[PDB]
Amino acid sequence: TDTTPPTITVPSDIIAYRGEEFEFYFEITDDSGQVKNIELWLEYSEDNFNVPGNATSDNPLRVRVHGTVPLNEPIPADKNRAQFTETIRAWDAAGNVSSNITFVIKYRAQTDKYNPADPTITYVDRLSSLSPSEKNAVEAAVRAANPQIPAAARITVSANGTVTITYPDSSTDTITANRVVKDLASSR
């Protein structure tokens, strides 16, 4: 008679960024070789659930879980609190449910993930007052040099040529003017 609850393997360093989809896998085994169901804004497919031989020791049950931390999820300055502590249960066909097993989802601002590369230099007439065409060229050069930042991020250019990269979660990066623009006359 089966009286042994299933065993759950959880990943340990799940880190996510706001507005960006993440994925990870649970691994569940039972001595009978069969796992009936599990219990946890996180999505996963119940395919191959409650099938004989779906959770052997050779081939554990792999539950691909995916979700997205909300773009505007507040992040405390004490980044050890910027995490979700959640639990997962699982039971076999005999009706033996495992204990509550913890997995941690730590969420961070998008600027923690991205370090923007400097663009090719744009030559301007006045370092203190960029024209509209020069600002367009600055934004295009920053975007072309940074294909790894999301397309939904907004790049703005100030009068002195300073670049502000506002990511979809409203976090920011800054590129100073002397990494972006140069006086046209002093270079000729």
Of 9, 45, 50, 136, which one interacts with a second copy (CB under 8 A)? 136
Q: Are 88 and 75 in contact (CB under 8 A)?
A: no
- Report the distance separating Cα 185 and Cα 188, nearest Å: 5
Residue 100 binds a second copy (CB under 8 A): no
Task: Work out the number of other CB atoms within 10 angstroms of the CB of residue 88.
Answer: 19
Q: How far is the CB of 58 from Ca ion (least distance, A)?
A: 16
Q: Which of 56, 68, 83, 96 binds Ca ion (CB under 5 A)?
A: 96
32 binds, among Ca ion, a second copy, none (CB under 5 to 8 A by kind): Ca ion
In the chain, the amino acid numbered 124 is: V
Q: Does residue 114 have a known ligand-binding role?
A: yes
Residue 17 near residue 112, CB atoms below 8 Å:
yes
CB of 132 to a second copy, least distance (A): 4
- The 3-class secondary structure across 59-101, one letter per residue, is CCEEEEEEEECCCCCCCCCCCCCCEEEEEEEEECCCCCECCCE
Rg of the chain in Å (alpha carbons): 25
The answer to whether 175 and 114 are in contact (CB under 8 A) is no
Nearest to 98 by CA among 37, 3, 2, 7: 7
Q: Is 167 in the site for a second copy (CB under 8 A)?
A: yes
Residues 52-91 that bind a second copy (CB under 8 A): 71
Range 6-21 burial, b when 16+ CB lie within 10 A, else e: bbbebeeebebbbbbe
For position 115 contacting a second copy by CB under 8 A, the verdict is no
Kindly state the smallest distance separating residue 144's Cβ from Ca ion, in Å. 13
Which of a second copy, Ca ion, none does 4 bind, CB closer than 5 to 8 A by kind?
Ca ion
Among 8, 16, 30, 130, contact with Ca ion (rule: CB under 5 A): 30
Query: Is residue 78 annotated as involved in ligand binding?
Result: no
Q: Which of a second copy, Ca ion, none does residue 114 bind to, with CB < 5 to 8 Å depending on kind? A: Ca ion
In the complex, the residues that contact a second copy under the rule CB under 8 A are 71, 131-133, 135-136, 151-154, 156, 166-168, 170
In the complex, the residues that contact Ca ion under the rule CB under 5 A are 2, 4, 30-32, 92, 96, 111, 114, 173
